[PDB]
C-alpha cells in the first residue's frame, strides 16, 4: 500500500493521475502536510525539495525536477542556450533572442537590429509583435517585469484551406532514470483566422493560444489538429510525412535540451527521486524547419489525450518505482 499527497489542486493533469491511483486500490491519498508519503504531487512555486528523502523507511518520489525551471523560463532558457557549449551561440533550432531588463544585452540587440535594417531583410520581432525597436523597448519598460525580445518568424508554414498559422505541442516525460519519453500523440494548436503578413496589430492570427482563439471550431473541433490529420495533410499537400519532415527535428531538440541540463537536475544518486512532465512548443516554417519557442514545466494536456497520457505517467514514472501486485511513448535514446 503506497501513499501520496496532492499540493497542487489546479493541476488538471495530476488530478487525473491521483484519480487513477486511488482507483487501483493500492494507492492511498494522505493530507497535504503528512510527511509520510511515497509520492508527492507538489506545488508549482516554493516546492520544498529540501525536506524530501529524509523519512526513514520511505522511498520518496516527486513529480518535479529541481532546477528544471532554468529550461522552463524564457529568460533562463535563452541564457541556458547562449552559455551552454552543447547548444552554443550558433544554435540552429532556437530563434535569435535577447534578454532585456526594464530601466542586460540591450546594446547587443540593437547591433543585430541594424544588420536587419542595413540588409533590407525581415526585421520583425516579438516580446507584442512589432518591427520597430523603439515601440518594443517602451512596452517592456511600461509593463514592469523582465521580458525577452525574440526574432519573429515572418515566413511560417500555413495550413490549407485557410492560410492558417499554428504551433506544435509535444508532451515529454522524464522518469527517475532520466529516460526521455516522448508522447506519440501531439497537437497542432491552430489559428482559425487567416495569417495576415502586413498587419501585426491583429494578434488573433499571429498568436495561436487555445484561450485567445476562444472562427473557433470551423476547420477542426476546438482549433486542435491531431497528428493523424496533419500527417495526412503533409502527404497530400507536400508529399512528405510528419515523422521525416518535422518529428526528427523535434526529437533532436527535446533530446538536446534535456541532455544539457542532465548533470544539474539528475536525481540518480540522490536520497530522493524525481520525474517530470514537460511541454515543448515548436514552430514550423515554410521550408519545413522546426523552431523551439519554449518549454513548459507545468503543462496542460488535451481533452482527448488526458485518459491515455495520465495513464502513461502512472505506468512508467510512478509504478516503475512503486510496483503493483504497445507503449504510448517514444524513448529518445542517449
Amino acid at each position: 500500500m503506497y501513499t501520496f499527497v496532492v499540493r497542487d489542486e489546479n493541476s488538471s493533469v495530476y488530478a487525473e493521475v491521483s484519480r487513477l491511483l486511488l482507483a487501483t486500490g493500492q494507492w492511498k491519498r494522505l493530507r497535504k502536510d503528512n510527511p509520510r508519503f511515497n509520492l508527492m504531487l507538489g506545488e508549482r512555486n516554493r516546492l520544498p525539495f529540501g525536506r524530501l528523502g529524509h523519512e526513514p523507511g520511505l522511498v520518496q518520489l516527486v513529480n518535479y525536477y529541481r532546477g528544471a525551471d532554468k529550461l522552463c523560463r524564457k529568460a533562463s532558457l535563452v541564457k541556458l542556450i547562449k552559455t551552454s557549449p552543447e547548444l552554443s551561440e550558433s544554435c540552429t533550432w532556437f530563434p535569435e533572442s535577447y534578454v532585456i531588463y526594464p530601466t542586460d544585452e540591450r546594446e547587443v540587440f540593437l547591433a543585430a537590429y541594424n544588420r536587419r535594417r542595413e540588409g533590407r531583410e525581415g526585421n520583425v520581432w516579438i516580446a507584442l509583435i512589432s518591427s520597430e525597436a523603439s515601440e518594443l523597448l517602451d512596452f517592456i519598460d511600461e509593463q514592469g517585469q523582465v521580458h525577452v525580445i525574440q526574432k519573429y518568424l515572418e515566413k511560417p508554414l500555413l495550413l490549407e484551406p485557410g492560410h492558417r498559422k499554428f504551433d506544435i505541442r509535444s508532451w515529454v516525460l522524464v522518469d527517475h532514470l532520466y529516460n526521455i519519453y516522448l508522447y506519440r500523440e501531439g497537437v497542432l494548436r491552430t489559428s482559425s483566422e487567416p495569417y495576415n503578413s502586413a498587419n501585426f496589430q491583429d494578434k488573433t492570427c499571429h498568436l495561436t493560444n487555445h484561450c485567445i482563439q476562444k472562427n473557433y471550431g470551423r476547420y477542426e473541433e476546438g482549433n486542435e489538429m491531431f497528428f493523424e490529420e496533419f500527417n495526412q495533410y503533409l502527404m497530400d499537400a507536400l508529399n512528405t510525412t510528419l515523422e521525416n519532415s518535422i518529428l526528427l527535428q523535434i526529437k533532436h531538440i527535446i533530446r538536446s535540451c534535456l541532455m544539457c541540463i542532465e548533470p544539474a537536475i539528475s536525481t540518480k544518486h540522490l536520497h530522493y527521486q524525481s520525474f517530470q512532465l514537460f511541454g515543448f512548443d515548436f514552430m514550423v516554417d515554410e521550408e519545413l524547419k522546426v523552431w523551439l519557442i519554449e518549454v513548459n514545466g507545468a503543462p496542460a494536456c488535451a481533452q482527448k489525450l488526458y485518459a491515455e497520457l495520465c495513464q502513461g505517467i502512472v505506468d512508467v514514472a510512478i509504478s516503475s518505482v512503486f510496483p503493483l501486485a504497445t507503449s504510448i511513448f517514444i524513448k529518445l535514446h542517449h
Binding site: 520544498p48 529540501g50 525536506r51 528523502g53 529524509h54 526513514p56 529541481r66 548533470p263 544518486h269 536520497h271
Partner: protein, 437 residues
C-alpha cells in the same frame, strides 16, 4: 607553537571525543599509558602534536581535553576505559542527574550549578598553555546537556577568553538513531544562543553517517560505536593540520579565513572519501581522481543536501596518503567540466589544497579498511541550509500546538525565547537565500 583545548559535552560529545583521542594516539604513536617512544624531547617541547598534547616529566603525553556531562554514566566508561591512564581525574567532570533531553534544564537549572566548576577545570589547562589559540567543542543538538550546557559554556568562554577562537563539532539530530522527540526544540535553542559565539561549526547528520555505514561498510544496524569511529576519521582529517607540519589551516583563525567569509554563515559542509569495508576483499584502490570526484557526491557528505542548487563561498581539499599536486589539478580540471560548481560572484572559484603523505590511520578491529589515499573536502555551500529548513519545519509543527513547551517553562525558561530563537533561524535561512540565489 600554539595550544588547543578540546571540550566534550554530553554523551555524544564525550563518546565522540573518545573516538578522536583514541585515533589521535594511534596517529602520533602514543600508547594508552601516555608514553610516546618517538618523542625524543622528554618532559616537554613545542612540536605540532603538542597542540593537542601536554607533556609531564615522566614522559606522559596527556590530552588538553575536558570531558563534561551532567551524568556519570558515560564519562565513567572513560574512567575505566582502555585509555584510563591517558587523562587525569580533574579533566573528567560529572553531575548527578542529566538534563533529560531538556535544553532549559541543561542551560538554566542544572547548568548553573556546575558552570563555575567546569570553567575552573578549563582554566587549569589554559594556564599550562604558552599561547592558547582557542577551543574545539564536541556536542549534540538533541541532548539537553549537549545543547543546553554547551550554549551556556560558549557564552562564558567568549567572556573569559574573548580573543580566543571557538570551533564546534555538532551532531545534527536523526530520528533513525535518537529516542528523543523534542530534539528540534533543543537544536534551534542552542543554535540561536551559540551562533554569535561560534567562529566555525562542522555539522554532522547522523542520518548521513548512518546510511554511509549501511551502504559502504555493509552494517545492517549501525551502532554509536560504528558512527563515532567514522566521525572520528572526518574530525581527524580536519584537525590534522593543527597536529602535523604544514602550511594550510595551521591555526584556528585560519579556519575562519579560508572557509567563513560571512560570520553568521559558518557551517562548512564536509565530504569524505573513500569509506571501504574492512571485511571487503579484492578491493580495488581508488585513485586521486576517483576520490576527489566522490567529494561532490551527496552520498558521501556529512549532511544530505544538493550543492548543485547552492553557491560556494569556499572550498578546501584535505588529502591523506599517496597524493601529489599534479594528480589533484588534473582531477579538478576534469570535475569542473562535468559538474555544477557555482561560486558567489564576490569570491574566487578555486580550491585550497592540503596534502599529508601519511595515509589515514584506522582503528585495529574497526570497520574501515586501510586505503592508500583519502580526502576530506570542506566546502561552505549555501545548500546546507536544507538542514535548517528541515529542522525549523519540525519546530513549527510542534510549537504551533505548544507541545512539550511546559517542560521548558517549568525550568524557568520563557515561552518568548522559543519564538525569539525561531526568528533568528528565520533570519538565518534568509541569509542563505540572499547568498544562494
Amino acid at each position: 607553537m600554539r595550544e588547543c583545548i578540546s571540550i566534550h559535552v554530553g554523551q555524544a560529545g564525550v563518546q565522540i571525543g573518545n573516538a578522536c583521542w583514541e585515533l589521535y594516539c594511534l596517529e602520533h604513536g602514543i600508547q594508552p599509558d601516555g608514553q610516546m617512544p618517538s618523542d625524543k624531547t622528554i618532559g616537554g617541547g613545542d612540536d605540532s602534536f603538542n597542540t593537542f598534547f601536554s607533556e609531564t616529566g615522566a614522559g606522559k603525553h596527556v590530552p588538553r581535553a575536558v570531558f563534561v556531562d551532567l551524568e556519570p554514566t558515560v564519562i565513567d566508561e572513560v574512567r575505566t576505559g582502555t585509555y584510563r591512564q591517558l587523562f587525569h581525574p580533574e579533566q573528567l567532570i560529572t553531575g548527578k542527574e542529566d538534563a533529560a533531553n531538556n535544553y532549559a534544564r541543561g542551560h538554566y537549572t542544572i547548568g548553573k550549578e556546575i558552570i563555575d566548576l567546569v570553567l575552573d577545570r578549563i582554566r587549569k589547562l589554559a594556564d599550562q598553555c604558552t599561547g592558547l589559540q582557542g577551543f574545539l567543542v564536541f556536542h549534540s543538538f538533541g541532548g539537553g546537556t549537549g545543547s543546553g550546557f554547551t550554549s551556556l559554556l560558549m557564552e562564558r568562554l567568549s567572556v573569559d577568553y574573548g580573543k580566543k577562537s571557538k570551533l564546534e563539532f555538532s551532531i545534527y539530530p536523526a530520528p533513525q538513531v535518537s529516542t528523543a522527540v523534542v530534539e528540534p526544540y533543543n537544536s534551534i535553542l542552542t543554535t540561536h544562543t551559540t551562533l554569535e559565539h561560534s567562529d566555525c561549526a562542522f555539522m554532522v547528520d547522523n542520518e548521513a553517517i548512518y546510511d554511509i555505514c549501511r551502504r559502504n561498510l555493509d552494517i545492517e544496524r549501525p551502532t554509536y560505536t560504528n558512527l563515532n569511529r567514522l566521525i572520528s576519521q572526518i574530525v581527524s582529517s580536519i584537525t590534522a593540520s593543527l597536529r602535523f607540519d604544514g602550511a594550510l589551516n595551521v591555526d584556528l583563525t585560519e579556519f575562519q579565513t579560508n572557509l567563513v567569509p560571512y560570520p553568521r554563515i559558518h557551517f562548512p559542509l564536509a565530504t569524505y572519501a573513500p569509506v571501504i569495508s574492512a571485511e571487503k576483499a579484492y578491493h580495488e584502490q581508488l585513485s586521486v581522481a576517483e576520490i576527489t570526484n566522490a567529494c561532490f557526491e551527496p552520498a558521501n557528505q556529512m549532511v544530505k543536501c544538493d550543492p548543485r542548487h547552492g553557491k560556494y563561498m569556499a572550498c578546501c581539499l584535505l588529502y591523506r596518503g599517496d597524493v601529489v599536486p599534479k594528480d589533484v589539478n588534473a582531477a579538478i580540471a576534469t570535475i569542473k567540466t562535468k559538474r555544477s560548481i557555482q561560486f558567489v560572484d564576490w569570491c574566487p572559484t578555486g580550491f585550497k589544497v592540503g596534502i599529508n603523505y601519511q595515509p589515514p590511520t584506522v582503528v585495529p578491529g574497526g570497520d574501515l579498511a586501510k586505503v592508500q589515499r583519502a580526502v576530506c573536502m570542506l566546502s561552505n555551500t549555501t545548500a546546507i541550509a536544507e538542514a535548517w529548513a528541515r529542522l525549523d519545519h519540525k519546530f513549527d509543527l510542534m510549537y504551533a500546538k505548544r507541545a512539550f513547551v511546559h517542560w521548558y517553562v517549568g525550568e524557568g525558561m520563557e515561552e518568548g525565547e522559543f519564538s525569539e530563537a525561531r526568528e533568528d533561524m528565520a533570519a538565518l535561512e534568509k541569509d542563505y537565500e540572499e547568498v544562494g540565489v
